[model samples]
Target: MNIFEMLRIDEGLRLKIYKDTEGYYTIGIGHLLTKSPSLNAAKSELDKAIGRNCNGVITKDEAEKLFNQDVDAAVRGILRNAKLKPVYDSLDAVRRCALINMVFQMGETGVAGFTNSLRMLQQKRWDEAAVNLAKSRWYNQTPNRAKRVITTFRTGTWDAYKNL
Candidate 1:
């Protein structure tokens, strides 16, 4: 499966506004409206895509576009990092998507803090890498999501997305 298919299941989609786990205004596949640089700018783009004022509503295509943009940013951010670039480059496609999925949720800097885990990943020590990841607060904060991500890292397969 592609990154979009994987993350779409992880993030879930919504056509209208709702509160996220942290109670922030979100829409369109975990797009945080509250955290947006400018709501006006976000609205304008959404409006343009739908050919009218969307208010807090968005189409499936609009959500898909937003997800692609977010994933692209995550990929770029990971590759742009000096430390992450090498580790990322050393990974196969499935392993690479696992890293991208982590970055998509946590951002590059957050994932960057896992120095030992990254080292293990780069070395292809899958079990050790997973152990290191499991020790983080992120693993506890969203236990199910973290488990799936960790499993993906450990197995280097799309097993987690098989049912989806």
Candidate 2:
């Protein structure tokens, strides 16, 4: 699967902002989130979760490899979630990838909470889908990352967004 693209869905998941256990500030797929060239700059919150050391920290390359090995089950789970799997599958590649990032951020239950945005996607309302996503608390919480996702999903020019 497109591991790099999946990581791009949410910048928080890369830096100290990841919400896996955003509730307790110590949640994630366990030692996965390491660092971010885009977002990380002097924060090792995730590393401390595993251990407070240079080795404890996960590098961008290591994060990408770990993601490659582990993210498939989560992706497959989303794909098999009987009710919404079909809707997720109906989306084109760009949209589907975006949704995968959403799932990674919030899990099926959380991402599923994007009722309006998800509906806009399955309904083939691309513009509406991007707008709905922008209206979310997710968008407000991290304006910068959301802008990139919205732009990429809308225009299909992924270089800046993906690279960001």
Candidate 3:
């Protein structure tokens, strides 16, 4: 499966705007409310479906485009977040990708919330970090995903997206 599919499996697809569990207005595969009103129209098929408070609509292609761009941006933010730098760079590509996946699933702040995991990461303790990752509430909510992600951190092997 593709990144879009992975994210779709995580965040339910919504063609219309609705309040997320957090109460923020969200739409189209979890694109949280955007601030720039004009960004709603800055691209083809953008509408309140992507941006702020007004109502609008978009096609699946456009929604996927938004998801792709958002993931790209999220990966960039994780790479640049100073607190995560040492562990982020020290990880093997597979492990790094695993972290990137978590960052996308949960925002940078959410990822950062894993204090023990980050500590183990900074200490270069791969095994502990993997175990820590697997023990999170995020993991409890999606044990299978957590297992695959932790395996990458533990063994630097990436087969997380092979079938699902």
Candidate 4:
């Protein structure tokens, strides 16, 4: 599948997830304090939170800001919850971003729920990881958003038409 298929973000919700106060287009999850008014602001805040330069490209800054912590903390949480090793061991920025994006949207606890998927990813079992990713409560609950993220994770490319 694709990132949009994984995330379940449709045309209507696509507009909803945008840059917030911190500077990235964040997925609105209720009237929370983290919600941003625009994608740019949310992306900016996320970039600052992650200590990235944000060279006119949206990076993990927004994802990091969503957790209200530094990049190390965010990465640690993802590694811990996903049961994966440190990013330094074998770095994959795109994959890391995809995972971090999920954690940012789902929180540590919510994100940790992907036990099977995490295990599969740790083993470098791409097919298994993809299966585990699809078999998520988040996927079942939010097919559109889940699909989008899963697609990105699997293919490492977000469909152009889905890009807002």
Candidate 5:
């Protein structure tokens, strides 16, 4: 499956607000409405997306639309990272989806902090990259999701997502 489809499964859709793993107010396929210029600004945007006042809820269609936008934003953020760009450019599609998946959840800045991992990825050292990622707090915080991403990188195939 493509990155967008993978993320729809990975993130999961919610029409109502729920606490993300980190306890942030999230909804609409893991969209973070807890941080923006301000909470009001985020709430206002959500209201607009749902085409009415947002009472911590949204429509399925609105959530799907937000998911697409968030995925695109994640891709844009990844491409904007100077060090990440070249490494990202060198990867095959499956491995590339793995990177985008991480960035989608943790932000490009968070993924960028894995300097050693990125270096290994750049050199096509799949094992080393997986090992480095497995050692992070991100993995500890969300082992199942991280395992899938790492497996995608290590195997360089869509097999990791097949059972999902």
Candidate 6:
């Protein structure tokens, strides 16, 4: 069975088994999957729960939905309030996803407040940006998450960008 099926993902969700252009699986949870209050819906909701509980155990649908809800808000906030156009312009889709994932975990204000890192990213100073990322409150508060993002930034890998 594929990874999604192994994860017991319901057919209602659009399961993109392969990573997308953004370097992460673009797992899609249909409205139908989340609209009901039945066991299936509960299972789907369970997919989105944060922390270690749902990390490798939850369905892709729920994870995608949760990622969208969690990351989209932070991304929008950065784009809307912090003039993140330059950052967006400089990053690849995967890096963008990594940035959004970091921002989601750190909150928009916290992530966007990385003036040195943001400047480095805008200038394509990848090493410096990675160093700045490692020095932030996010690194101090969520070391695991910060490590993952730094790895992604350094390696240009999509694996760390999954699930936002």
What's the TM for model 2? 0.64
Give per-model TM-scores.
0.87, 0.64, 0.69, 0.51, 0.91, 0.54
Model 4 TM-score?
Answer: 0.51
lDDT of 6 by residue, 51-96 (tens): 3444224466455655457445666776786556578667876577
List all candidate RMSDs to the true structure: 3.0, 6.8, 5.3, 9.3, 2.4, 10.8
**Which portions of model 5 miss their true places by more than 4 Å?**
35-45, 48-51
lDDT per residue for candidate 4 within 57-105, as digits (tens), equals 4333353233244334546776675343443234255566567667656
- Tens-place lDDT digits, model 2, residues 3-102: 3554644533342334333333222233334334422432365544435453334556645554655568558868777656976788777666666666
- Inter-residue clash pairs, candidate 3: none
lDDT against the true structure, each candidate: 0.84, 0.59, 0.69, 0.52, 0.86, 0.55
Task: Show the lowest summed lDDT stretch of 10 residues, model 4.
Answer: 6-15
Tens digits of lDDT, candidate 3, 1-164: 44455567667777665556545556677777643344344232344334543355556776787788888887788878876667688776666777777888678888878889988976779887887777778888778767766766777654565655
- Where does model 1 exceed 4 Å of error? 35-52
| Residue-pair clash count for candidate 1 | 0
How many clashes in each structure?
A: 0, 2, 0, 45, 0, 0
Candidates ranked by lDDT = 5, 1, 3, 2, 6, 4
Higher-scoring candidate on lDDT, 3 or 6: 3
TM-score of candidate 5 against the unseen true structure: 0.91
Which of the two, 3 or 6, has more TM-score?
Answer: 3
| lDDT per residue (tens digit) for residues 17-39 in model 1 | 77677665677888766655566
Q: Judge candidate 1 against the unseen true structure and give its global Cα lDDT, from 0 to 1.
A: 0.84
